[PDB]
Amino acid sequence: NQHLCGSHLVEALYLVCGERGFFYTPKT
Amino acid sequence: GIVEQCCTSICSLYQLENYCN
């Protein structure tokens, strides 16, 4: 399951958000 | 959205946090 973004976006979201996950629009 | 903002460029850890649930 390789990554799409040069920034390693998906893997960085697992670290920041953990297990509650993320949505595509920021809240602030 | 997050793909348009944080995929070509690295986004801060503060910035990524604003996208969490």
Epitope: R20, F23, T25, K27, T28 | G1, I2, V3, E4
Partner: antibody, heavy 117, light 107 residues
């Protein structure tokens, strides 16, 4: 001024299809994530579909996932919702809504859908 | 996707008076709560975001407050065009609406 104008609502038989349109003006449409939200006859607001500003990302609740498809044409400042295999629980007023941040900040005036035999 | 319990379902108030609505979240929502006004035949209109920050152009007689799980919305000096249905929306974890509060005129 910011304007959103929905159109295409009508009466559809159960199992039918219908494509809704939303016309945007008064702002840079391609910078904004957009959603469709519906109000049911019992006056509940229901998030129906979401698409990110460049169209890369999409989200649907399980109640419509697989039957609805949201899409956009940024050169024509238009948002669309293609609905299919329609059911009576889909009957509602359907609104277009802009998401600069995650909370909605502008809505259209709505277009009405009725699903009935 | 958190459950918002809005109450009361309906209220009656007099011109010049004052009304208060509450929203209770099923879990902590970190002050990411917005409030909308909805009149028959129009689309909803955003009043307040981040619990108490007024949207530009919205009169100052509207206000909100709260933290954690417990929030409230208020109208000072009720004007006749304030008659409407009001909704809350949490947007900390995805997004979800309260059931609404129908505001009518005392007489």
């Amino acid at each position: 001024e910011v304007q959103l104008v929905e159109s295409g609502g009508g009466l559809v038989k159960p199992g039918g299809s219908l494509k809704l349109s939303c016309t945007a003006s008064g702002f840079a449409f391609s910078d904004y994530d957009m959603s469709w939200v519906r109000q049911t006859p019992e006056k509940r607001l229901e998030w129906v579909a979401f698409i990110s500003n460049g169209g890369y990302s999409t989200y649907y609740p399980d109640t419509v996932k697989g039957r609805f498809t949201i899409s956009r044409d940024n050169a024509e400042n238009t948002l669309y919702l293609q609905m299919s295999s329609l059911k009576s629980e889909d009957t509602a007023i359907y609104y277009c809504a802009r998401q600069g941040l995650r909370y909605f900040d502008y809505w259209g005036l709505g277009t009405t859908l009725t699903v009935s035999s | 996707d958190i459950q918002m319990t809005q109450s009361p379902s309906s209220l009656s108030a007099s011109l010049g008076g004052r009304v208060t609505i509450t929203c209770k979240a099923s879990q902590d929502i970190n002050k990411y709560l917005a409030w909308y006004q909805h009149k028959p035949g129009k689309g909803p209109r955003l009043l307040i975001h981040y619990t108490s920050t007024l949207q530009p152009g919205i009169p100052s007689r509207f206000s909100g407050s709260g933290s954690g799980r417990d929030y409230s919305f208020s109208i000072s000096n009720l004007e006749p065009e304030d008659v409407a249905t009001y909704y809350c929306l949490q947007y900390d974890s995805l997004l979800s609406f309260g059931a609404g509060t129908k505001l009518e005129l005392k007489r």
